[PDB]
């Protein structure tokens, strides 16, 4: 999904 200030 997403993490911190990035999403994948
Ligand atoms: O958890 C995740 O998928 C990431 O940090 O990209």
Nearest-angstrom CA–CA distance, 2 and 8: 6
Q: How much distance in Å is there from the Cα of 8 to the middle of ligand 1?
A: 6
Half-sphere exposure of 6 (CA within 13 A, CB side): 1
Radius of gyration from C-alpha coordinates of the chain: 5
5 lines ligand 1 (CB under 6 A): no
């Amino acid at each position: 999904x997403c993490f911190x200030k990035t999403c994948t």
